[PDB]
Amino acid sequence: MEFKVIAEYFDKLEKISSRLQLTALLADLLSKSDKTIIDKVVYIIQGKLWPDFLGYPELGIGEKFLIKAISIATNTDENSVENLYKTIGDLGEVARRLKSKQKESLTVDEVYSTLSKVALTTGEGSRDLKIRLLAGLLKKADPLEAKFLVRFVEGRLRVGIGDATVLDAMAIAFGGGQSASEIIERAYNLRADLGNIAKIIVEKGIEALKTLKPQVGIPIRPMLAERLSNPEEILKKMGGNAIVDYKYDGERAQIHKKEDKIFIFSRRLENITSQYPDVVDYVSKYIEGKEFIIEGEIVAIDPESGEMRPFQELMHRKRKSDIYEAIKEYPVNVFLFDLMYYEDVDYTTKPLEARRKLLESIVKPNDYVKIAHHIQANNVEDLKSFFYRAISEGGEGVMVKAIGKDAIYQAGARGWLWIKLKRDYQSEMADTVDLVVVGGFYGKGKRGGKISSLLMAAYNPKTDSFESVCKVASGFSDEQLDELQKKLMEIKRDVKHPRVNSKMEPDIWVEPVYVAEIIGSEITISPLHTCCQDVVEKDAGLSIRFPRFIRWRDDKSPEDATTTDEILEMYNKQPKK
After folding, report:
1. Does 425-577 carry CATH code 3.90.550.10?
2. Which candidate in 247, 384, 422, 471 is catalytic?
């Protein structure tokens, strides 16, 4: 197979505007290709030598060096090449012009092997080798081949075609038509290696793709998530049942292990293994299994408090020159959340509960690699509570995932099996306040011995009083709930504090000291509460509907609390319906 056919493709590509004609062009090019080297053609036509996930050096050379190569190939001095470059603005076209100004034609095979060499050659003699290699290529090239070889090496073939475009053309060229698209797409989603897929289609035919399974070392296209902002709508989609994961702000890492070698692919399926030798170490140390494909979030972590840091800190990490310095300054944890392959067995067809069960069992307990924080929600209030805990930890929100036999791993697809519930739930709980704890309530039943409900108040600066706005029981983690008893008992008072104004009687009154961030859906008129007493409705104050504890505000004194005036303001903003 001659390289001219590809140069001709590139030239035609520039002149066409029709999506139809593109498909036809590519299908033709692929079907008239040497079947033996289809796996190279599929990347060449996009301007590449190989898929990104391999982590191989990108093809490139300094421009001065390209000019040297063209100069050598065309037997024109570098100055003249330089001067033509100014007026033309593309070294490819310069190369073309200088070639057409003056017997075996280039094969795709030699172009590929030569360009691979140019990409992979490193160290001291590499400048001169790259130049010689390119010059020899450009020499053998016809004018048009030279133009597109230059562009290719420069990364200035502006093809604007991706794997999807080529998969489509492969359907047309080899699969018998558009009907082949689905089988070809499904295979690529399981094994996102265009060359691997083309090879199979060409050698064994299309039908061989139907039984295709993942191959450890080749990324699976990440399963994507739908999105909804209504927790009730989400759980209905789920059959009223779901696994709910914390949605982490980090790098979504697909982690492969084959016999001993560990690969890490980013959200974009770039090879990021070398950025995370610490993650490589955690995986090899703490994950049992010969070979596997799993997925987790790499999250930057605070070196002293271990708390999560935003994704931008991982970008800062990437910019550090010293990897050990980078790791020490920007440690990471891994929050694993799926498993798609384990010891020669494809898990993508197995239900999420089964993949998770396996995933959990293979991780030895440790401080670094953990299963995503999750629950099984069997009702919308489980989901909401968990969503609210997730964002109280500053989080994006949660990912809600179907369970059962339909809950398979849908490689590359966005559908209803995973749905993200994000902070954009800024429609329901539309109001966030800092309120003062002025009392507590014992819970009921077996926790009738523990305070599990707080009487909260807003600050009235005119009267220097705390006016009750709500009784909050939801939002407290088990740990926060347990801490309440001591926290409040320490400041228990036998009679209502004279600065606290409440008609509602808690089980214990408390010194007005502690401030909590509270969220609710809206502010409502309440006869039970004294906040803005009588201002909107007589014999009633204002209250917070469906309050949830978010967090303590240690950084606030009780007089820094949300004021009654602010409560009124928020209420007065609410639709008057």
Report:
1. no
2. 247
